[PDB]
Amino acid sequence: KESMKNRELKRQLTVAKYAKKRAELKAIIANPNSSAEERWNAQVALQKQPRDASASRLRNRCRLTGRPHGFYRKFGLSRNKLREAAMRGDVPGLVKAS
Amino acid sequence: RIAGVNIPDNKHTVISLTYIYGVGRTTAQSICAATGVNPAAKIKDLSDEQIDQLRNEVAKITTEGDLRREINMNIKRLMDLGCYRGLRHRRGLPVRGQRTKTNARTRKGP
Amino acid sequence: ATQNYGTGRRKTATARVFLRPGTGKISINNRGLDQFFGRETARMVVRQPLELTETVEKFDIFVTVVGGGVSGQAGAIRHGITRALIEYDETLRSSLRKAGYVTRDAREVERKKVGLRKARKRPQYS
Amino acid sequence: RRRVAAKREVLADPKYGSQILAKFMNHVMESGKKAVAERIVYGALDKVKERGKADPLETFEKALDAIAPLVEVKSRRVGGATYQVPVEVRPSRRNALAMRWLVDFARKRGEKSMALRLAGELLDAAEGKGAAVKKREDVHRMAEANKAFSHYRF
Amino acid sequence: IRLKAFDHRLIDQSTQEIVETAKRTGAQVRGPIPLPTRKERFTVLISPHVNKDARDQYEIRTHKRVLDIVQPTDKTVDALMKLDLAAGVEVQISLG
Amino acid sequence: PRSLKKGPFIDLHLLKKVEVAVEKNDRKPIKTWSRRSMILPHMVGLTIAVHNGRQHVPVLVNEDMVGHKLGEFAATRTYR
RNA sequence: ACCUCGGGUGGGCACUCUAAGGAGACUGCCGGUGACAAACCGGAGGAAGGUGGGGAUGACGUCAAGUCAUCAUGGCCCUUACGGCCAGGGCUACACACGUGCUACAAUGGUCGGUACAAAGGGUUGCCAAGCCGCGAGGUGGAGCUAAUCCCAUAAAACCGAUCGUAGUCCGGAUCGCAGUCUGCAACUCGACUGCGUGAAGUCGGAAUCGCUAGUAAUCGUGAAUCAGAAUGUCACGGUG
Numbered sequence: 001k002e003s004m005k006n007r008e009l010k011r012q013l014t015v016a017k018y019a020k021k022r023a024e025l026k027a028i029i030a031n032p033n034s035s036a037e038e039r040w041n042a043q044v045a046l047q048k049q050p051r052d053a054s055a056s057r058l059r060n061r062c063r064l065t066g067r068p069h070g071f072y073r074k075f076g077l078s079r080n081k082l083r084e085a086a087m088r089g090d091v092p093g094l095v096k097a098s
Numbered sequence: 099r100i101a102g103v104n105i106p107d108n109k110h111t112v113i114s115l116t117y118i119y120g121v122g123r124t125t126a127q128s129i130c131a132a133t134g135v136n137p138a139a140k141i142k143d144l145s146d147e148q149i150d151q152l153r154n155e156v157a158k159i160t161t162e163g164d165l166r167r168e169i170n171m172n173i174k175r176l177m178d179l180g181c182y183r184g185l186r187h188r189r190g191l192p193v194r195g196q197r198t199k200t201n202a203r204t205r206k207g208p
Numbered sequence: 209a210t211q212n213y214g215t216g217r218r219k220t221a222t223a224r225v226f227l228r229p230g231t232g233k234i235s236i237n238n239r240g241l242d243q244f245f246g247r248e249t250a251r252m253v254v255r256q257p258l259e260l261t262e263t264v265e266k267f268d269i270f271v272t273v274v275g276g277g278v279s280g281q282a283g284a285i286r287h288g289i290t291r292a293l294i295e296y297d298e299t300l301r302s303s304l305r306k307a308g309y310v311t312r313d314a315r316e317v318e319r320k321k322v323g324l325r326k327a328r329k330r331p332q333y334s
Numbered sequence: 335r336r337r338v339a340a341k342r343e344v345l346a347d348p349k350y351g352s353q354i355l356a357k358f359m360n361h362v363m364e365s366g367k368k369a370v371a372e373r374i375v376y377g378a379l380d381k382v383k384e385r386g387k388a389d390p391l392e393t394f395e396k397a398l399d400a401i402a403p404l405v406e407v408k409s410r411r412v413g414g415a416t417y418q419v420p421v422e423v424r425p426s427r428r429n430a431l432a433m434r435w436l437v438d439f440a441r442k443r444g445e446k447s448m449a450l451r452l453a454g455e456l457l458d459a460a461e462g463k464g465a466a467v468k469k470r471e472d473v474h475r476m477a478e479a480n481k482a483f484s485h486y487r488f
Numbered sequence: 489i490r491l492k493a494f495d496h497r498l499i500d501q502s503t504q505e506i507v508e509t510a511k512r513t514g515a516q517v518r519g520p521i522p523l524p525t526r527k528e529r530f531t532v533l534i535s536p537h538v539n540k541d542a543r544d545q546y547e548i549r550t551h552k553r554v555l556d557i558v559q560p561t562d563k564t565v566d567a568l569m570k571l572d573l574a575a576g577v578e579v580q581i582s583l584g
Numbered sequence: 585p586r587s588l589k590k591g592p593f594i595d596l597h598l599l600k601k602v603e604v605a606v607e608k609n610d611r612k613p614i615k616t617w618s619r620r621s622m623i624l625p626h627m628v629g630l631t632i633a634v635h636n637g638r639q640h641v642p643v644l645v646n647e648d649m650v651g652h653k654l655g656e657f658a659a660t661r662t663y664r
Numbered sequence: 665a666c667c668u669c670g671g672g673u674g675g676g677c678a679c680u681c682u683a684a685g686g687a688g689a690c691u692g693c694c695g696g697u698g699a700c701a702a703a704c705c706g707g708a709g710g711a712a713g714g715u716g717g718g719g720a721u722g723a724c725g726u727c728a729a730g731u732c733a734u735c736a737u738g739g740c741c742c743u744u745a746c747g748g749c750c751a752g753g754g755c756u757a758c759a760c761a762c763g764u765g766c767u768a769c770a771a772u773g774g775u776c777g778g779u780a781c782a783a784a785g786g787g788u789u790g791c792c793a794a795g796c797c798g799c800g801a802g803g804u805g806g807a808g809c810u811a812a813u814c815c816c817a818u819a820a821a822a823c824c825g826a827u828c829g830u831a832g833u834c835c836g837g838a839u840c841g842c843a844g845u846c847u848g849c850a851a852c853u854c855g856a857c858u859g860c861g862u863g864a865a866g867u868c869g870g871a872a873u874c875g876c877u878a879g880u881a882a883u884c885g886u887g888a889a890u891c892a893g894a895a896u897g898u899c900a901c902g903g904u905g
Binding site: 213219221246247272273274275276277278280281311313314316317318319321322327328332334 | 678679680681709710711712716717718719763764765779780781782783822823824873874875876878879880881898899900901902903904905
Binding site: 003007022032043046047049051053054055056062065066067069070071072073074078079080081084096097098 | 718719720733734735747748749803804847848849850889890891892893
């Protein structure tokens with residue numbers, strides 16, 4: 001859809017917006033020398049943030065097409081747009097071989 | 099009665115202690131380590147002296163006549179509460195989260 | 209001098225074989241020959257081109273082999289020493305061309321192809 | 335079917351100095367377990383030298399030629415009647431028929447200590463009371479009931 | 489000196505553009521040394537709606553190439569870097 | 585599961601709708617869509633309306649229900 | 665030469681290796697055979713002998729074969745919802761039947777103790793060593809590292825010694841109770857592994873039916889993509905043969 005790319009655009013904003021406090025709240029919990037009173041109130045600040053901030057909510061879709069399945073991260077393309085753009089000599093250094 | 103149950107003969111000790119039903123294989127390797135009985139000899143070649151020390155270890159883990167009693171109440175606690183793990187455990191379905199549509203035949207028979 | 213360099217490859221192995229006059233000194237990777245190849249028939253297969261050309265007692269042998277499999281390194285030495293024996297002349301050329309020792313075995317492993325599961329095995333249909 | 339098939343050769347037995355035994359060793363190997371099968375064939379070779387004072391190659395040389403048959407059937411159907419024809423076994427083929435019959439009856443011997451199963455097989459066939467010798471002679475008897483079909487619609 | 493590009497009809501044709509254009513200015517630069525090659529296979533499915541056993545597999549290469557000076561006294565190649573870069577060659581400097 | 589470094593789990597809005605709702609005692613069921621949280625000995629004997637998926641079902645909290653979460657007591661699928 | 669005995673070091677450019685550029689194989693040559701003409705059967709030499717082995721490359725067309733849910737578009741309908749937004753649930757339900765795939769059914773084995781040899785690949789939003797604490801999965805710890813350097817990373821089968829005596833078993837591991845660690849805001853429906861305990865069916869499997877002509881079938885491991893987490897599948901590389 002087009003309305004479905006648009007709702008997973010703003011997830012990428014809200015993850016990259018906060019992005020620093022959640023490093024600190026997970027720095028407090030991960031220490032064995034940390035006190036649980038400093039841990040328990042640190043648990044409060046995680047769950048009162050909106051949940052669309054973790055990377056697990058983020059879903060790497062194809063950038064030109066939007067199809068979820070068949071994505072590679074050494075490119076930005078889908079499974080079936082990568083073929084049509086490679087036969088036209090665009091992708092540099094890419095050939096067939098055996 | 100011999101050690102809680104009858105124990106076979108002409109066998110090594112760790113294999114012989116396996117039938118006591120509450121001690122597996124790794125646990126019976128500790129009992130011969132803690133007491134000092136050599137597993138490499140048979141149970142025939144042993145002395146009638148130190149078997150109490152083997153019988154001391156049986157009085158510290160569990161006994162199958164009461165092991166099956168107490169594990170039933172672990173089942174029975176799950177059933178009478180009506181929790182989901184005891185909900186299917188009343189009926190006969192798998193428990194841990196296996197697949198049910200096909201192939202779960204060792205809880206339903208032929 | 210009299211040092212003779214011999215190489216030989218079989219089943220992705222590679223053996224440096226040096227050959228010089230000596231008295232039965234067979235040493236491989238600073239190990240004895242009976243110690244290196246543990247319990248196999250190829251302990252004698254490395255001697256088979258040597259005892260064919262009746263020079264089993266007349267040379268030092270220094271072998272360094274890398275890569276390959278267990279019994280693939282033993283074939284690398286057997287191909288390797290035959291190239292080192294023919295640096296002398298071609299008197300033993302006909303004694304080895306007829307023996308079938310000089311030709312490198314070209315039979316290498318084959319790649320997995322799509323649709324198939326092995327190199328040539330394919331799943332069952334009905 | 336253009337005729338293609340060339341010949342590949344395996345002849346290696348350094349610890350005993352033999353040629354028939356190496357080809358027999360390949361009929362015992364399962365899935366490339368050669369070093370396992372090598373010590374079982376020698377493991378059933380020394381028990382014969384333990385049993386008989388003669389060199390156990392000759393026991394193996396005699397045990398082949400009382401399992402190896404002479405003629406056998408060949409169900410060549412005329413296309414409307416199923417016939418069988420007793421045919422002369424080619425001299426190259428008749429070695430491998432005995433060695434393949436020998437191993438398959440060793441596996442159903444049902445003893446302990448696996449090299450003793452093959453040990454008893456090579457002892458019997460120097461006499462004739464083996465199951466491989468009884469399987470040999472029974473197929474010999476199948477040819478003479480089949481002997482009417484030797485040339486005629488054959 | 490180390491060089492990275494995508495085809496051997498550039499990167500092994502720009503070393504002579506550096507070896508000649510540095511040994512001319514007096515300093516000694518030895519012969520270039522090859523390295524192992526990056527090879528990356530990409531097996532992609534080819535049909536839009538599914539038919540699995542029709543596939544197609546590509547490969548992207550990366551050629552490496554290492555130079556070696558002896559006596560550093562020339563800043564001539566430092567100005568002649570925009571010349572020696574042509575289309576797809578990257579040069580990290582290790583002036584030994 | 586949920587290893588003992590990070591010991592308990594309960595939801596934040598559930599806690600203020602219980603701990604303050606202890607101070608005025610049990611005269612109402614607690615209607616909550618949350619199912620990820622456990623029950624606790626601060627909550628022995630309450631009445632919770634756990635979301636089935638299309639309705640809420642009542643829960644009689646006992647003392648021997650403490651370790652298990654709320655999910656084992658709401659249904660999902662019928663199979664009549 | 666050096667050494668502390670590690671190419672450790674000076675050194676060397678012999679080598680292995682790496683990758684650029686070349687030669688080599690054409691029925692060329694010998695004999696026979698054919699209409700002596702294509703060719704065929706033998707022979708020498710040669711690393712290779714008769715398209716050396718493998719791979720990519722699929723003609724005019726067929727089945728109105730498949731896809732409007734990858735994308736693009738003619739038309740048709742919805743446009744106070746057949747469009748948007750957010751919670752929980754669901755696709756993982758379950759007398760049954762069919763398709764592929766893995767283990768097993770043991771003694772060419774099973775355990776314990778030693779010990780030997782690979783290719784190929786990924787890693788500065790990462791790999792995460794030494795030391796270190798844990799029955800064990802791990803926890804600390806922070807190096808080295810932008811890669812023939814550092815890490816992933818210990819190949820397994822084989823071999824050697826021991827016990828095991830062919831018993832539904834020192835076989836097999838399903839189920840299940842209990843106890844743990846890891847990721848993630850969150851392991852109830854619904855994750856993966858670890859400990860301990862319990863131990864099933866299964867003693868080679870009808871009518872039928874499929875794969876394969878040589879580094880091949882058969883058997884043993886390793887890696888990558890997708891990926892916070894999660895492979896018995898897919899793709900890929902080697903051992904023994």
